[PDB]
Design a protein around this ligand. Structure first.
Ligand SMILES: Cc1n[nH]c(C)c1-c1ccnc(Nc2ccc3c(c2)N(C(C)C)[C@H](C)C(=O)N3C)n1
Length: 123
């Protein structure tokens, strides 16, 4: 099975709008989202569709760019570091679940390289 997806709203969670979070949406997420390797990461892993009942037995903190995008658009975060942590969870999950040299890992590695280039000069 699939678990419920990560929340993208939480009314009693306190929220901030910062220039760093705006840049994460307008630049970092936008750049990754258009990439030719973005597609597996644009929504939660669908273990039912992929017939991978093991996925959510291995990965207990799922995260994906569709969730991050909605969190940024919906003003979910307190600060930029919280969002950066979500990106790192997404990449790390993929490295944990898969093996070096797998196609999905090559895709994550290319996206991570671009991610780090964009954050290397946040505002
Ligand atoms: C890429 C590939 N290879 N073989 C098949 C079949 C597919 C395929 C076909 C249709 N959709 C998808 N979506 C997909 C989305 C996310 C992930 C993955 C697949 N992968 C795969 C290695 C299973 C793992 C669970 C992962 O970590 N993430 C992040 N994948």
């Amino acid at each position: 099975m699939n678990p419920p997806p990560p929340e993208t709203s939480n009314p009693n969670k306190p929220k901030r709008q910062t220039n760093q979070l705006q840049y994460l949406l307008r630049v970092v997420l936008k750049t990754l989202w258009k990439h030719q390797f973005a597609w597996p990461f644009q929504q939660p892993v669908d273990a039912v569709k992929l017939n991978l009942p093991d996925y959510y037995k291995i990965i207990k903190t799922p995260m994906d760019m569709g969730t991050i995008k909605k969190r940024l658009e919906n003003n979910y975060y307190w600060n930029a570091q919280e969002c950066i942590q979500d990106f790192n969870t997404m990449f790390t999950n993929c490295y944990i679940y898969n093996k070096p040299g797998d196609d999905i890992v090559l895709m994550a590695e290319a996206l991570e390289k671009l991610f780090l280039q964009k954050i290397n000069e946040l505002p």
